[PDB]
Symmetry: C3
Subunit: 210 residues, 3 copies
């Protein structure tokens, strides 16, 4: 068939489908895109694969990306709202447009941290940074940065809550379980599937600190 | 062929296209899905057909479902925001995840009442109940229950208005024309195509 | 055959793809629809091509229309929220529904002015008028009219800002560069790719006034 995915429940690691060199993905992060057919490359829109001078998409490890999520690249796509016209004369081929200026403006890289959950059909605008552990609700339109462990939703996306207390977020950012050795991760599965941040932090501290 | 539907103006009854046993639909309700290609089955996302221990979708009679509407099932899909990580270790095959716990949690059935109009590309969240006669605006993201004859819109969806007065809604919920024999409906078409709720209510009692 | 567009960066003029006679489009306006596959005709939903008695869609020149934008036609599609039931008995073939009344109500034409930028996957509701120079943010749901040079976004779309001052907007509406002779447009390319509305206005005045 045309569907890249064999099952609605099928989630395929990002690094097994990405071909665009300007998409940088960490391990284990996955995309479950059955309901939109295409692989993850086409979630990332208007990203030139051959140019090193445009905004890149960087995704950390252990991210969950729902079906049909969109990452908008290419900044303003050549449209300048502060110029007289938003029409991209520079990029349509008409000899009457020869003296046009190039209206393309970059927005900066889009950076998704570790352990980020992106709900189905959410749209990430250009240049957005999403902190570790954040949650983007389904159908969000994310127009500005999202803090670590922050939950946002709506269009434009706005703050809903933080997943944990400030001291709990500080502990998680210090211990950075996503960067632990494979052996530590495997040994920690039961703890990571729980709310026991303090226990895991104290356990990590005795093992990793000196 | 590219499309389940022959025409943009073609609406196909739900009970002529649904195959998932966990989707229960009443008569005459239809889906007009030309602009998204697939039949109604694929509107209903992540619903295991073979299982009886998962949230079901129930839709009443006389509902109008616009193109590309989405009914989210499978509850939290194995992601626990209250756990340290939302990553679904239990459901990804890596030997390092062998001791993970199953984060799946049910949300409850999604229940759509009778005579509900769902606008194109609305998304219904898991476990939501939508009362009889409601209207879901196009592109709504319905995150909580909707009352009978309530109009909602936006993302998240929020109250816009009620279609009728409190007493008129009481009369409609009491007479429940959707359950009338179709011979009755034939004689009632002029009333149903009008705002004369009290008039029909009086005829019903008589 | 998979995609009407060869490349994500491909923008094809509306007047090279529209076949529906109830869609009227000006020159140079384009649709870049790679990420949704279909040509512009299928952006315009429920628009009977053969009837002269239904709401039409009119699009001025120099518009930029992003992928998957939706223009909702056919008004209420036969559903009357003020009737006892929204179910369109008139349009379902059933001898028990013979005495049903036609619930279809028109909303008026959808009119989109010159030089309008419509972001990807915005939805334009029936009967909406969008003034010259407006910007519709990505994923907007436009339920009401939008003023000239107004920026709107969200669902339902709401006022964000005006692009230019009241003086500058009045100047642009008066000078109407989109209607200029081709030779004037060509000579004006650099000015159009700038913020100097008043400078262009004064130049146009000296050249056009009597
Ligand atoms: Cl939205």
């Amino acid at each position: 068939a045309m569907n890249f995915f064999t099952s609605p429940f099928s989630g395929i690691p990002l690094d097994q489908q990405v071909t665009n060199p300007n998409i940088i993905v960490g391990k284990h992060s996955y995309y479950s895109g059955y309901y939109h057919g295409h692989s993850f490359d086409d979630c990332v829109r208007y990203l030139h694969p051959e140019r090193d001078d445009v905004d890149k998409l960087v995704i950390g490890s252990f991210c969950s990306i729902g079906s049909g999520a969109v990452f908008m690249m290419a900044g303003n796509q050549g449209h300048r709202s502060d110029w007289i016209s938003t029409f991209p004369f520079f990029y349509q081929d008409n000899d009457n447009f020869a003296d046009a200026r190039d209206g393309f403006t970059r927005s900066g890289d889009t950076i998704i941290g570790h352990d980020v959950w992106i709900g189905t059909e959410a749209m990430i605008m250009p240049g957005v940074k999403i902190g570790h552990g954040a949650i983007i609700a389904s159908r969000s339109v994310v127009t500005k940065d999202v803090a670590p462990y922050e939950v946002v939703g709506s269009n434009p996306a706005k703050h809903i809550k933080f997943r944990f207390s400030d001291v709990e977020i500080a502990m998680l950012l210090e211990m950075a379980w996503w960067n632990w050795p494979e052996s530590w991760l495997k040994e920690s599965m039961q703890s990571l599937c729980s709310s026991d941040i303090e226990g895991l932090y104290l356990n990590w501290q005795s093992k990793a600190r000196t």
